[PDB]
């Protein structure tokens, strides 16, 4: 980096030099996938403890999947 600048009094303007490009010219697209399961309710009466907290993070799972489904079937906007 040897950044330099010149002011031009004639025209009230100034130019800073010394910089290096990184321009986006194009795009790499790649598909990103996630494998899901779907389950019935087939659970439990119970419990002791550490399947009460497992079932929860799994209510959550179904919640998520529910939203994404709700992003129903149209073009997303730029």
């Amino acid at each position: 980096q040897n950044i330099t600048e010149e002011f031009y009094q004639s025209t009230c303007s100034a130019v800073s030099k010394g910089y290096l490009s990184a321009l986006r010219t194009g795009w790499y697209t790649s598909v990103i996938t996630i494998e899901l399961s779907n389950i019935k309710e087939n659970k439990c009466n119970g419990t002791d403890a550490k399947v009460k907290l497992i079932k929860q993070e799994l209510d959550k799972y179904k919640n998520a999947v529910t939203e994404l489904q709700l992003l129903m079937q149209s073009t997303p906007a730029t």
């Binding site: 330099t4 002011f7 130019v15 800073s16 910089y19 010219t25 996938t33 494998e35 399961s37 087939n42």
Partner: protein, 408 residues
């Protein structure tokens, strides 16, 4: 100023086009069944395009190796730990992803660490068809790359979720860029209202590119990082390199430099990479200070400049601007304010935008078609009317053709 010369793209037309492809019934299975159990294939589809694919989260299995390892001796008990943690935090990711698409209606940027992890990001950057200068660049600036990437919700099917991810390709790298900063240049003469101004409108970033120059009129569609400028070519015009001639001699015959004219002489400053331009007009108090020891220069009306060597602050009116402390050398190139070359009396009042030569043309138009129609009117008090068409042959005399009587 020049952003309205931009064209207009469609940032995720490529990503969306990949998405459209994934909806051809056969296509998903082809993806699913090509990631059989490798985690990064490169499928091809009905049209037969090269879709690099990449499974980042198997929860089908993980949940169908503890629907089973829990649908048996639960109902009901306590199992252990380890299998919550490993899940807890897998699902977590999916929730983050899911938030993101929820609030942005299925399109996100910057692209998050949950949407793609450094670990995942860096692999992609690694099998990319790009040189190693690029690979390094992207690798030393992932959060920038994230900022230039979009993620696009695509399909949710029986048990696949896909989203497309659009990563920047940096097809131009390490070429010399520069930044042009401009402020209004006006006459400083005394009766409020008599003054005229001109502002070069061609501010922005400029980078050398394929023999031409790429110009970016909204200098904030470019992020500097020490001495590297990240831009996006979508918000640029492609100009002849001759455009840099405007910084050498604004009147040059090779390129017609863009300016704006007005009579609005109001004060301001533009903070540059290594200093401040100051355009001080009227009664305004304009100053520059060094932090420890206060005001050290007081500006006269007109347009001037201070480097950042010694200055920390510049004040114009009631606006305090901190200066950038970046190390570099400035050079003040003396010259005569060009606004001094123009007769106020036939300067253009306002002109949204014009060029130096367009202004010149209008000025001729005005100079000429005033003084011709003026040395025209420098033949008056000296022309004479028609003597009646009833045969009369008078002889010019008195400021009227009278009933004569003396020398005929």
């Amino acid at each position: 100023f020049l952003g309205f010369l931009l064209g207009v793209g469609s940032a995720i037309a490529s990503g969306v086009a990949v998405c459209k492809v994934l909806h051809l019934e056969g296509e998903v299975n082809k993806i699913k069944s090509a990631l059989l159990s490798t985690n990064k294939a490169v499928v091809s589809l009905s049209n037969g395009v090269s879709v690099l694919t990449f499974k980042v989260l198997d929860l089908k299995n993980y949940i169908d190796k503890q629907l089973l390892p829990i649908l048996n001796k639960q109902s009901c008990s306590i199992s252990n730990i380890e299998t919550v943690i490993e899940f807890q935090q897998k699902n977590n990711r999916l929730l983050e992803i899911t938030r993101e698409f929820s609030v942005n209606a299925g399109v996100t940027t910057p692209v998050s660490t949950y949407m793609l992890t450094n670990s995942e990001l860096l692999s992609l950057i690694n099998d990319m068809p790009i040189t190693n200068d690029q690979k390094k660049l992207m690798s030393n600036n992932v959060q920038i790359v994230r900022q230039q990437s979009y993620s696009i919700m695509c399909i949710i099917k029986e048990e696949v979720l896909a989203y497309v991810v659009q990563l920047p390709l940096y097809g131009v790298i390490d070429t010399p860029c520069w930044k042009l900063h401009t402020s209004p240049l006006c006459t400083t003469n005394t009766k409020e209202g008599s003054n005229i101004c001109l502002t070069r409108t061609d501010r922005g970033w400029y980078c050398d590119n394929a023999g031409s120059v790429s110009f970016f009129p909204q200098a904030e569609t470019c992020k500097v990082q020490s001495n590297r400028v990240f831009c996006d070519t979508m918000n640029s015009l492609t100009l002849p390199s001759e455009v840099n001639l405007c910084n050498v001699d604004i009147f040059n015959p090779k390129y017609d430099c863009k300016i704006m004219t007005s009579k609005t002489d109001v004060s301001s400053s533009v903070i540059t990479s290594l200093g401040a331009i100051v355009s001080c007009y009227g009664k305004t108090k304009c100053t520059a200070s060094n932090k420890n020891r206060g005001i050290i220069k007081t500006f006269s009306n007109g347009c001037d400049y201070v480097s950042n060597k010694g200055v920390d602050t510049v004040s114009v009116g009631n606006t305090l601007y901190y200066v950038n402390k970046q190390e570099g050398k400035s050079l003040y190139v003396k010259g005569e304010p060009i606004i001094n070359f123009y007769d106020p009396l036939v300067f253009p009042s306002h002109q949204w935008h014009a060029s130096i030569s367009q202004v010149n043309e209008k000025i001729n138009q005005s100079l000429a078609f005033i003084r011709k129609s003026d040395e025209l009117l420098s033949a008056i008090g000296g022309y004479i009317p028609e003597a009646p068409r009833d045969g009369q042959a008078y002889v010019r005399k008195d400021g009227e053709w009278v009933l004569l009587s003396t020398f005929l």
